[PDB]
């Protein structure tokens, strides 16, 4: 369960911000709305 500005990374088992992926290469499919 992550907010609308975060995706879940199974390696760290924690919600990672989308900003770190939006402004950097192709973000995950779930962050396309936050960019």
């Amino acid at each position: 369960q992550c907010s609308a500005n975060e995706y879940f990374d199974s390696l760290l088992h924690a919600c990672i911000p989308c900003q770190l992926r939006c402004s950097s290469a192709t973000p995950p499919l779930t962050c396309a709305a936050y960019c």
Epitope: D9, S10, L11, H13, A14, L20, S24
Partner: antibody
Amino acid sequence: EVQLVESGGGLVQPGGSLRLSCAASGFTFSRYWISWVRQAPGKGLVWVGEINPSSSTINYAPSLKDKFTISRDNAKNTLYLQMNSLRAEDTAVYYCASLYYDYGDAYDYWGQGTLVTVSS
Amino acid sequence: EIVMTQSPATLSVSPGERATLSCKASQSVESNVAWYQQKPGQAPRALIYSASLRFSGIPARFSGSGSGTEFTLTISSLQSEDFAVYYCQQYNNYPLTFGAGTKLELKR
């Protein structure tokens, strides 16, 4: 200083059992996932399994379903690995490790590894 | 399982120059690849966790990229302490699988 001291582990003929301990100290062990990873002499890394904080979701490796059993004791801030019926292919340096993402940064901590030798 | 094909097996290059590793995935793991460093005698040391996102305390010279089935860690300017083994890992599908592992040596 964070630490993940690993005790237990040595020599044992095939079919035998051997429990390993991975004691932590320096970070909240009870709020992160902690996994196991073995490395056969002169070879690559192998993901054994992982376990969540509340021990409500234990993920092993298919090829090692019956051999290994993972559990943790948050009261002692220590992870466990209960190995059962091993073979020569199960000889490796078993590392424990914990990855998480607090404080806005991603971290990772490892034990010094312990050698497990399976041979007659 | 998902086989991570990591080439070259060995790379020889001098400090200050560049180094680009490659890690091909048996099947599309999306952006869920990591990168570790291990020196003889010590335990692995992670560097990348989302194919580009870096861990804490990891210099900016380590630059990872790629998605789907092809990933590459780039060590822009090398240093003496950066010569070791490097693995790639996927965690999009269980179990987590590593790569064969490239090893950097110092060309002298």
